[PDB]
Design an enzyme around this catalytic site. Structure first.
Site, PDB file in Angstrom:
ATOM      1  N   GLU A 130      91.236  63.037   1.862  1.00  0.00           N
ATOM      2  CA  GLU A 130      92.428  62.181   2.145  1.00  0.00           C
ATOM      3  C   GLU A 130      93.011  61.413   0.935  1.00  0.00           C
ATOM      4  O   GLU A 130      92.975  60.199   0.845  1.00  0.00           O
ATOM      5  CB  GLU A 130      92.132  61.225   3.301  1.00  0.00           C
ATOM      6  CG  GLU A 130      91.699  61.896   4.578  1.00  0.00           C
ATOM      7  CD  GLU A 130      91.550  60.986   5.771  1.00  0.00           C
ATOM      8  OE1 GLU A 130      91.352  59.768   5.550  1.00  0.00           O
ATOM      9  OE2 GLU A 130      91.611  61.464   6.936  1.00  0.00           O
ATOM     10  N   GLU A 237      89.448  67.234  10.277  1.00  0.00           N
ATOM     11  CA  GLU A 237      89.189  66.095  11.190  1.00  0.00           C
ATOM     12  C   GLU A 237      90.171  66.051  12.282  1.00  0.00           C
ATOM     13  O   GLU A 237      91.398  66.104  12.047  1.00  0.00           O
ATOM     14  CB  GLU A 237      89.205  64.704  10.466  1.00  0.00           C
ATOM     15  CG  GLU A 237      88.324  64.558   9.233  1.00  0.00           C
ATOM     16  CD  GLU A 237      88.384  63.131   8.643  1.00  0.00           C
ATOM     17  OE1 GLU A 237      89.045  62.235   9.284  1.00  0.00           O
ATOM     18  OE2 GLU A 237      87.912  62.940   7.503  1.00  0.00           O
TER      19      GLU A 237
END
Ligand SMILES: CC(=O)N[C@@H]1[C@@H](O)[C@H](O)[C@@H](CO)O[C@H]1O
Ligand SMILES: CC(=O)N[C@@H]1[C@@H](O)[C@H](O)[C@@H](CO)O[C@H]1O
Ligand SMILES: [Ca+2]
Length: 302
Positions: A130, A237
Site C-alpha cells: 500500500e 486484501e
C-alpha cells in the site's frame, strides 16, 4: 477457479515500537493455524513483516538474523505444506517513517532479500504494501527497482506482485495508477495486486458493507483496465463483516472475479494470524469472526 486463493497471515508487523519485542509488540504467525487453513483448501498465504525489524540499521544493511529466521520459518511452513507464500514488506512505501526516495537503496534491499528465497519455487515477492500519499513516478520506479533487484539476485521462477498508489485500491486504480502498465520483467511474471474493502469509505474499518453489490462495483473498472492493458491482477486484501449484507457483497465480488479469471488470479482475505482476538475480519481458527462467519463463502473457491 483461481490460480491462488487464501489469506493474509499477520502479526510480525504489529505494534508501533521498532525493535519492539517479540511477544509484546509483535508475534509471528502460527504454523498449526496455517496448516489448518491449508486443510480447508487454501493454497496461498500473504505473510506480513516490517522492514525496520528485518533491517535494524538501514535497508541496505545486515539483518536481524532472528527476525529473518522467524520469517523464513513461517514461509517454509507454507511452502512445505505445498502452498504459495507471498513475502510482504508491509511498509507503505516508507522506511523509518520517511518515504523511500532512493530507488537504488530499494533495489539493493530487494536484491538481498530475494537472495534468501531464490531457490524456493513456491515463494512470491510483494514489492511493498500500500504505497500512498507519494509521487506517482516514484511509485512506478520503486516497483521497477524491486523487480530489478529481485531478478539480479537470481530469483527467476518467482512471481512479483506489484502495488500501486492510493493504498493500491481497486476502486481508485484507473484514476491514479495508469503509469503502472509500464512495468517490465525479464521473466514476464508481474501480477498487479490491488486491495478492496466494502465499507462506506473503503478503509476496511467497519463491519458494515455499503450494499449487497458494492464489492463487484468496486472492482469493475480495475478489471477492464487489466484486460485493456493485457495484465493480470490479484486482490491481496479484502474482507467484509459477518452479516448478511456483507456476505452478499463478498460473494458477488468473488463471483464477478471468477467470471474474469482471464485477469483475476485470485484473492487473499484480510486476515488470519494469532493476535487478532475479536477482530471483525479475523480468519484465524478455531473462532475468528470470519473464520466461523464467512469461511463457508470462501470454500466455494477451494
Ligand atoms: C518460545 C520462545 O523461544 N520464546 C522466547 C522467549 O522465551 C524469550 O522471551 C524471547 C528471547 O529469545 O523470545 C521468545 O522467542
Ligand atoms: C516461537 C518462537 O520461536 N519465538 C522466537 C522468539 O524467541 C524470538 O524472540 C523472535 C525474534 O523475532 O523469534 C521467535 O521465533
Ligand atoms: Ca532501527
Amino acid at each position: 477457479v483461481f490460480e491462488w486463493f487464501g489469506s493474509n497471515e499477520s502479526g510480525a508487523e504489529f505494534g508501533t515500537n521498532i525493535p519492539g519485542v517479540w511477544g509484546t509488540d509483535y508475534i509471528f504467525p502460527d504454523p498449526s493455524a496455517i496448516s489448518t487453513l491449508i486443510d480447508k483448501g487454501m493454497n496461498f498465504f500473504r505473510v506480513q513483516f516490517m522492514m525496520e525489524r528485518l533491517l535494524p540499521d538501514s535497508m541496505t544493511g545486515s539483518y536481524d538474523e532472528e527476525y529473518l529466521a522467524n520469517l523464513t520459518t513461517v514461509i517454509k511452513a507454507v511452502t512445505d505444506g505445498g502452498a504459495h507464500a507471498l513475502v510482504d514488506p508491509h511498509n507503505y512505501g516508507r522506511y523509518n517513517g520517511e518515504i523511500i526516495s532512493s530507488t537504488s537503496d530499494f533495489q539493493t534491499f530487494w536484491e538481498n532479500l530475494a537472495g534468501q528465497y531464490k531457490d524456493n519455487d513456491l515463494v512470491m515477492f510483494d514489492t511493498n504494501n500500500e504505497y500512498h500519499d507519494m509521487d506517482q513516478d516514484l511509485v512506478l520506479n520503486l516497483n521497477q527497482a524491486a523487480i530489478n533487484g529481485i531478478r539480479a539476485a537470481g530469483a527467476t521462477s518467482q512471481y512479483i506482485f506489484v502495488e500501486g498508489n492510493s493504498w493500491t485500491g481497486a476502486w481508485t486504480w484507473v484514476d491514479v495508477n495508469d503509469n503502472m502498465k509500464n512495468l517490465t520483467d525479464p521473466e514476464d511474471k508481474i501480477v498487479y495486486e490491488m486491495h478492496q474493502y466494502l465499507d462506506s469509505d473503503g478503509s476496511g474499518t467497519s463491519e458494515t458493507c455499503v450494499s449487497e453489490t458494492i464489492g463487484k462495483e468496486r472492482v469493475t473498472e480495475a478489471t477492464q483496465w487489466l484486460k485493456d492493458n493485457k495484465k493480470v491482477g490479484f486482490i491481496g486484501e479484502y474482507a467484509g463483516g459477518s452479516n448478511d449484507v456483507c456476505r452478499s457483497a463478498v460473494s458477488g465480488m468473488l463471483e464477478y472475479m471468477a467470471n474474469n479469471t482471464d485477469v483475476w488470479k485470485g484473492a487473499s482475505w484480510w486476515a488470519a494470524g494469532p493476535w487478532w482476538g475479536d477482530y471483525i475480519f479475523s480468519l484465524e481458527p478455531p473462532d475468528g469472526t470470519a473464520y466461523t462467519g464467512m469461511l463457508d463463502i470462501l470454500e466455494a473457491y477451494l
